[PDB]
Amino acid sequence: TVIKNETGTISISQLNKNVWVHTELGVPSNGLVLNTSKGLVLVDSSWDDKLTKELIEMVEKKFQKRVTDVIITHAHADHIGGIKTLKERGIKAHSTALTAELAKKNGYEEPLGDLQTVTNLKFGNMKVETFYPGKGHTEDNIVVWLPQYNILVGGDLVKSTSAKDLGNVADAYVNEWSTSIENVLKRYRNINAVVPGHGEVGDKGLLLHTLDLLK
Ligand SMILES: [Zn+2]
Ligand SMILES: [Zn+2]
């Protein structure tokens, strides 16, 4: 079930009753839309305010609920870029302290810096755990786990099958990235789906693929 917007710039495919993948062309970036009984929760918004606004507006209309929260999985422009939109609309922008301070350092408005190494959030019925596994794609990258579905949002820590290299490594810690991936595999031993930062949803295999890319 793939719902595109007017432009085809934004696309959402359903994973289950309450979890959707959002994908925007900026190179396609993935995030999640969590349809919860208390509103919509995004795992990552989009590249900039324009797309973040279109994203929110598309999901709010479709699901007939407000976006209440977003989880920002790292401070890169393409993840933090819609922060202005989130803050001015009173959408809670969750992040680790490190992501927030990187955002501030890079001139972005700050997300909450409320996430710890492991943080468990609950939005209505929807359970969400955020996990900082260590440095990888960036020093601050986190993953997001939906324990009710065993769905892992890998963000840019995790490369899709189609990714034949590590992408942008300017901010990366290619020595620690393998350990960070291991930390994810150790923590989540039973994974139903993994959503990479870009590309097609996969499973545990994407974490193995990322490991190989790191050799
Ligand atoms: Zn990045
Ligand atoms: Zn990304």
How is the chain split into domains, by residue range? 1-215
Find, among 97, 103, 177, 101, the residue nearest to 135 by Cα.
177
The residues with which 207 forms a beta bridge, in sequence order, are: none
CATH level 3 topology of 1-215: Metallo-beta-lactamase; Chain A (3.60.15)
The residues with which 93 forms a beta bridge, in sequence order, are: 70
- For the chain, the distance separating the N- and C-terminal CA atoms, rounded to the nearest angstrom, is 36
- Which among 18, 69, 74, 141 is annotated as catalytic? 74
Q: Strand 92-94 relative to strand 118-123: parallel, antiparallel, unpaired? A: unpaired
83 three-class SS: helix
- Which among 30, 48, 69, 76 is annotated as catalytic? 76
The residues with which 153 forms a beta bridge, in sequence order, are: 144, 195
Q: Strand 39-43 relative to strand 67-71: parallel, antiparallel, unpaired? A: parallel
Measure the CA–CA gap between 156 and 102, rounded to whole angstroms.
16
Does the annotation mark 79 as catalytic?
no
Give the amino acid at 37. Answer: S
Which resolution, in Å, applies to this structure? 1.8
Find, among 37, 12, 16, the residue nearest to 24 by Cα.
12
Residue whose pair of structure tokens reads 């590590």 in the numeric block: 166
Measure the CA–CA gap between 210 and 215, rounded to whole angstroms.
9
How close is the Cα of 35 to the center of ligand 1, in Å? 25
Of the listed ligands, the closest to the CA of 47 is: 2
Task: Give kind and range of the element (H or E) at residue 5.
Answer: none
